[PDB]
Ligand binder design. Structure first.
Ligand SMILES: *[C@@H]1O[C@H](CO)[C@@H](O[C@@H]2O[C@H](CO)[C@@H](O)[C@H](O)[C@H]2NC(C)=O)[C@H](O)[C@H]1NC(C)=O
Ligand SMILES: *[C@@H]1O[C@H](CO)[C@@H](O[C@@H]2O[C@H](CO)[C@@H](O)[C@H](O)[C@H]2NC(C)=O)[C@H](O)[C@H]1NC(C)=O
Ligand SMILES: *[C@@H]1O[C@H](CO)[C@@H](O)[C@H](O)[C@H]1NC(C)=O
Ligand SMILES: *[C@@H]1O[C@H](CO)[C@@H](O)[C@H](O)[C@H]1NC(C)=O
Ligand SMILES: *[C@@H]1O[C@H](CO)[C@@H](O)[C@H](O)[C@H]1NC(C)=O
Ligand SMILES: *[C@@H]1O[C@H](CO)[C@@H](O)[C@H](O)[C@H]1NC(C)=O
Ligand SMILES: *[C@@H]1O[C@H](CO)[C@@H](O)[C@H](O)[C@H]1NC(C)=O
Lengths: 192, 596
């Protein structure tokens, strides 16, 4: 076995501008216990069947984990564009993995606003898929140069999420993880 | 390297920044209206000041963007609303006259006084003291004193104050490149940039006046009939050849004539449509009152309420220490948070208000996909008239018999409908001349072609002409009784109530044709028709992103403010009133007859 509990049931979750990509390898994984949890809300699988992943499997079981607002969970899909999926976490086309999302109202929120999760709002060029871009460099909206001093065209990109406990279901912080499966030249696959 | 792409970057920054600050101000204001403490007034003012100061910084930054090269219309409307300077054009010595005067208006209006001069027994506030003396008593002498208990004890200290208000707010228009402050309120109806859909600011004066020539023949017979059934209680105190006294029209100002229904009932022998006794037999509570309103909306096609609304809003009067006011208002806190703030009761009015206040919520989530600057109604009249078209449908006998409140065997003859329609006529038709006359007086005093000594002689002479009210006592120019009303003292545009009626019946005929109802508009219903729900929801979801004249063409097909589908609602009442007024003196001239 491998500790899926330290990535699914973790107390602290990374933001989407700094999404952690931990490598899971050389382990047996029970994905059938994930099905009958009756707690997820946006369990969608791309490129694989729920039954086909059990008997036949792949190695290279990298997992991605980040925090997404509820109305913009739908951006995390291959071939789907938007704001988060274009500037923060771009999924490649023919993505052979599943997205696992669930509500985090009672723990990823606090009264007065949980301003601990950030996201990139302005970027000079669109992100090529499966890329993390941690940077503090500010945007250039027009033509005048910015020397770090905020102005009318500088527009510091890292804006903070606000997660109040009384927010609507579309604005609820949906705690989401992404599993990526691919079978490249790396040998020694491990199944479930 | 274009200004168009630079504005979209700034509006994307402003939309996320403002909705974080607007939710904090709305949450602080929500707690003030539920749990009143000494610190909660300061807590609401702390968040509201930094939100208002935030708009001061964003308005200055958006000023440097030129408006002559933005071909996109979605961001053009956002930049036009964000660049409204407002109070920033005035100097520091002049900006301090805004918050001092406006807070003085609210405190003066909050003083309830019905203590008799030279007889100081006791007196209560406005709600328990002032409303009972205009809606229940039938004595001419004390109601005339009660008329002078507020227009000579509260409005007398506004004459040097309100005139100071109308000489500096009028100066703001030249600094904001408007004509006058009355023209500033017409900027909500102003539409520019669309070919063939443009609405001039001066077109609103013409269109309101053009629609008033068909309101008048309905109002001629309504005023003629009500002057004959009011002189029965006052035989020798009013002459049935002239107009009506001001202190006999239901309220202190005569805005709503709902309290004249008991005095001027057409046929009181048969029982009225009243199910207040019916709900206490079936043990109705606050939860079941709003639950049937929710299932009414999902039957139309509108989405139902979220789970963060039933356990989050308040319904009854809570606790004993919470002395918060619970006037029925709709709350749009943003970020998916929607609340209703009212004290529920098992009555006719609170059940209809439950349908009425829910409609603003159903309008509020419709434009949730729109940006924050466009997260509003198409104008000031849309957000009020949308919340009232479901009030007309919920009061119908067909909808009342569908749930089971009304008796299963309730016949619908002539007199069972004239009693219902005249109750609707006193609250809808009766408020139209009062709304048009007061806003016409406010537009010219903001224009400035009314001198200081000619305020009252022109205000009273149009009430006698347009509304048709004889002054119960002569008043000189030192009185300031038109400013005593709630909306005029607190800087509220009152034209949104005149266009509320002309919008709430344009939508009613459009939705009834979508539901394919076979019959007149009074018996029509909206529920159990997803075709009518899809017609309404397409215009609700637009918000302010589209011009309001395009919102009419999405429902009624007429780009202008149509007045024809309102007389069709009152055709059963008007034809009976034309036969009832065969011998009565219908149509008043100028009348100084009773109080010369
Ligand atoms: C995360 O924690 C929850 C809560 O303990 C786990 O859910 C439990 O799963 C086991 C295994 O089927 C059940 O026997 C328990 O009854 C479940 N508890 C509840 C409260 O439902 C969940 O399995 C954990 N997930 C991970 C990946 O560790
Ligand atoms: C709107 O639709 C509802 C749903 O059918 C109607 O409720 C039905 O009413 C009849 C008699 O009034 C009952 O026999 C049914 O059992 C009810 N159905 C349900 C599901 O409760 C309602 O009457 C309709 N209203 C109108 C005005 O047509
Ligand atoms: C409600 O108000 C009372 C006093 O007005 C205060 O003691 C109490 O803590 C308040 N409760 C809440 C939930 O704000
Ligand atoms: C304006 O820009 C918005 C950006 O999303 C776009 O959706 C809209 O179609 C544009 N309108 C016009 C008239 O180009
Ligand atoms: C707002 O005030 C500034 C300060 O003078 C001015 O430059 C700007 O033109 C004003 N905006 C409008 C729309 O009048
Ligand atoms: C709203 O309607 C949908 C559609 O049937 C339903 O799934 C949901 O539970 C309803 N929500 C409430 C609060 O009634
Ligand atoms: C309505 O009044 C007319 C005029 O007398 C009468 O003929 C008709 O029967 C009445 N309708 C009902 C339903 O009583």
């Amino acid at each position: 076995l491998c500790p899926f509990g330290e990535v699914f049931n973790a107390t602290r979750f990374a933001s989407v501008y700094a999404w952690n990509r931990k490598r899971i390898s050389n382990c047996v994984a029970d994905y059938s216990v994930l099905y009958n949890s009756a707690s997820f809300s946006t369990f969608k699988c791309y490129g694989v069947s729920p039954t086909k992943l059990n008997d036949l499997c792949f190695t290279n079981v990298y997992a991605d984990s980040f925090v997404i607002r509820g109305d913009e969970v739908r951006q995390i899909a291959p071939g789907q564009t938007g704001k988060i999926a274009d500037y923060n976490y771009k999924l490649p086309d023919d993505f052979t993995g599943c997205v696992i999302a669930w509500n985090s109202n009672n723990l990823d929120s606090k009264v007065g606003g949980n301003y601990n999760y950030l996201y990139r709002l302005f970027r000079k060029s669109n992100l090529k898929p499966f890329e993390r871009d941690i940077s503090t460099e500010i945007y250039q909206a027009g033509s005048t140069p910015c020397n770090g001093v905020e102005g009318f065209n500088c527009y510091f990109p890292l804006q903070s999420y606000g997660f109040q406990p009384t927010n609507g279901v579309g604005y609820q912080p949906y705690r989401v993880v992404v599993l990526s499966f691919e079978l490249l030249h790396a040998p020694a696959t491990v199944c479930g | 390297s274009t200004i168009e792409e630079q504005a979209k970057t700034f509006l994307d920054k402003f939309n996320h920044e403002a909705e974080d600050l607007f939710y904090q101000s709305s949450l602080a204001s929500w707690n003030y209206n539920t749990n009143i403490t000494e610190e909660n007034v300061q807590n609401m003012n702390n968040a509201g000041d930094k939100w208002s100061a935030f708009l001061k910084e964003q308005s200055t930054l958006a000023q440097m963007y030129p408006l002559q090269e933005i071909q996109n219309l979605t961001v053009k409307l956002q930049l036009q609303a964000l660049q409204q300077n407002g109070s920033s054009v005035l100097s520091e010595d002049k900006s301090k006259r805004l918050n001092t005067i406006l807070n003085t208006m609210s405190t003066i209006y909050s003083t309830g006084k019905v203590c008799n001069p030279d007889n100081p027994q006791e007196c209560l506030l406005l709600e328990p003291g002032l409303n009972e003396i205009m809606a229940n008593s039938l004595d001419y002498n004390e109601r005339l004193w009660a008329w002078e208990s507020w227009r000579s004890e509260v409005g007398k200290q506004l004459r040097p104050l309100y005139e100071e208000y109308v000489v500096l707010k009028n100066e703001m228009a030249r600094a904001n490149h408007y004509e006058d402050y009355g023209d500033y309120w017409r900027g909500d109806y102003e539409v520019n940039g669309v070919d063939g859909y443009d609405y001039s600011r001066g077109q609103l004066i013409e269109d309101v006046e053009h629609t008033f020539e068909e309101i008048k023949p309905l109002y001629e017979h309504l005023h003629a009939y009500v002057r004959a059934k009011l002189m029965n209680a006052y035989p020798s105190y009013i002459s049935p050849i002239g107009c009506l006294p001001a202190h006999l029209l239901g309220d202190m100002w005569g805005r709503f004539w709902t309290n004249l229904y008991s005095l001027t009932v057409p046929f009181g022998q048969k029982p009225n449509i009243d199910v207040t006794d019916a709900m206490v037999d079936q043990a109705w509570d606050a939860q079941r009152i709003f639950k049937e309103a929710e299932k009414f909306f999902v039957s139309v096609g509108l989405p139902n309420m979220t789970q963060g609304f039933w356990e989050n809003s308040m319904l009854t009067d809570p606790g004993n220490v919470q002395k918060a006011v619970c006037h029925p208002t709709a709350w749009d806190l943003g970020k998916g948070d929607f609340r209703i703030l009212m004290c529920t009761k098992v009555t006719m009015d609170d059940f209809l208000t439950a349908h009425h206040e829910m409609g603003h919520i159903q309008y509020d989530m419709a434009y949730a996909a729109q940006p924050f600057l466009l997260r509003n109604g198409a104008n000031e009249g849309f957000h009020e008239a949308v919340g009232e078209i479901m009030s007309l449908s919920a009061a119908t006998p067909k909808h009342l018999k569908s749930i089971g409140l009304l008796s299963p065997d309730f016949q619908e003859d002539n007199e069972t409908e004239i009693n219902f329609l005249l109750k609707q006529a006193l609250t809808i038709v009766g408020t139209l001349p009062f709304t048009y006359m007061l806003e016409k007086w406010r537009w010219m005093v903001f224009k400035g072609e009314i001198p200081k000594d000619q305020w009252m002689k022109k205000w009273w002479e149009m009430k006698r002409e347009i509304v048709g009210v004889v002054e119960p006592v002569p008043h000189d120019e030192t009185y300031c009784d038109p400013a005593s009303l709630f909306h005029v003292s607190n800087d509220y545009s009152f034209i949104r109530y005149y266009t509320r009626t002309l919008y709430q019946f344009q939508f009613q005929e459009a939705l009834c044709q979508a539901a394919k109802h076979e019959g007149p508009l009074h018996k029509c219903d909206i529920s159990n028709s997803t075709e009518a729900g899809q017609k309404l929801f397409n215009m609700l979801r637009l918000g302010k992103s589209e011009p309001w004249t395009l919102a009419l063409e999405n429902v009624v097909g007429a780009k202008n403010m149509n007045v024809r589908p309102l007389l069709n609602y009152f055709e059963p009442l008007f034809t009976w009133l034309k036969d009832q007024n065969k011998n009565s003196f219908v149509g008043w001239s100028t009348d100084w007859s009773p109080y010369a």
